[PDB]
């Protein structure tokens, strides 16, 4: 069993559900931006979903990232951005402006505030439906927001069942071509996936990096080799390189087991 810097860790065979690795697998910790995995999952599960539906970037999304100095997809207010592009903005650069736009769009209510509260409730419902007991969401971006390496791994596994989700998370780079306030086509600067495993770990297919003041450095990873898919989560590692080596060690162990 490898030694990892993360205080929390878990991994299972994605296809069979058999546990391959544990380290405080059921101990609750802050999740930070790995929360975005649930945001995507909820969106992709909407009955009224339309990937080509365009959303107008509101000033509120922009002010939101500035007010928190948070990660962003650099969405320009006034631009028309499709739900599909928003999913890439959410998952690759970990855009909190994109998350807001998605929560606003798929939450139920007559005001943005109401729809956001509704969206987060949808996130908790999704967790309950998965039979989880150690996961709770207080936000749509991860900015009372906790989970565990096991719970998060199950959430990711469920999300990986959606082909669109799988496509997004394994994409290393994506350039959004948005529609300007005046009808023009804008070529945004290229979005790069923050998950370094996609290029460092052979077979890597996901899923999403995460971090936060309390969550520290997190990573939900997945890779396939020989038709065998290992999916796991590392919570509260000590750094970006450490989170990656932690995941690498667990995956190698899981494949050799």
Curated annotation (Swiss-Prot):
Broad enzyme group: hydrolase
Similarity comment text for this entry: Belongs to the peptidase S11 family.
UniProt pathway: Cell wall biogenesis; peptidoglycan biosynthesis
Descriptive protein name: D-alanyl-D-alanine carboxypeptidase
Family matches, as Gene3D superfamilies: DD-peptidase/beta-lactamase superfamily
Substitution effect: residue 94 to A: Almost no activity
Gene Ontology cellular-component annotations: extracellular region
An individual GO BP term: cell wall organization
Active site, renumbered: 33, 36, 94
EC number: 3.4.16.4
Role description: Removes C-terminal D-alanyl residues from sugar-peptide cell wall precursors.
Assigned keywords, A-Z: Carboxypeptidase, Cell shape, Cell wall biogenesis/degradation, Hydrolase, Peptidoglycan synthesis, Protease, Secreted, Signal
Sample GO molecular function, one term: serine-type D-Ala-D-Ala carboxypeptidase activity
Residues reported to bind substrate: 208
Subcellular location per the Swiss-Prot or TrEMBL entry: Secreted
Catalytic activity: Preferential cleavage: (Ac)2-L-Lys-D-Ala-|-D-Ala. Also transpeptidation of peptidyl-alanyl moieties that are N-acyl substituents of D-alanine
Keyword Isomerase assigned: no
PANTHER family attached to this UniProt entry: D-ALANYL-D-ALANINE CARBOXYPEPTIDASE, D-ALANYL-D-ALANINE CARBOXYPEPTIDASE DACB
Superkingdom of source: Bacteria
Primary localisation category: secreted
A Pfam family hit: Peptidase_S11
Record has Cell wall biogenesis/degradation as a keyword: yes
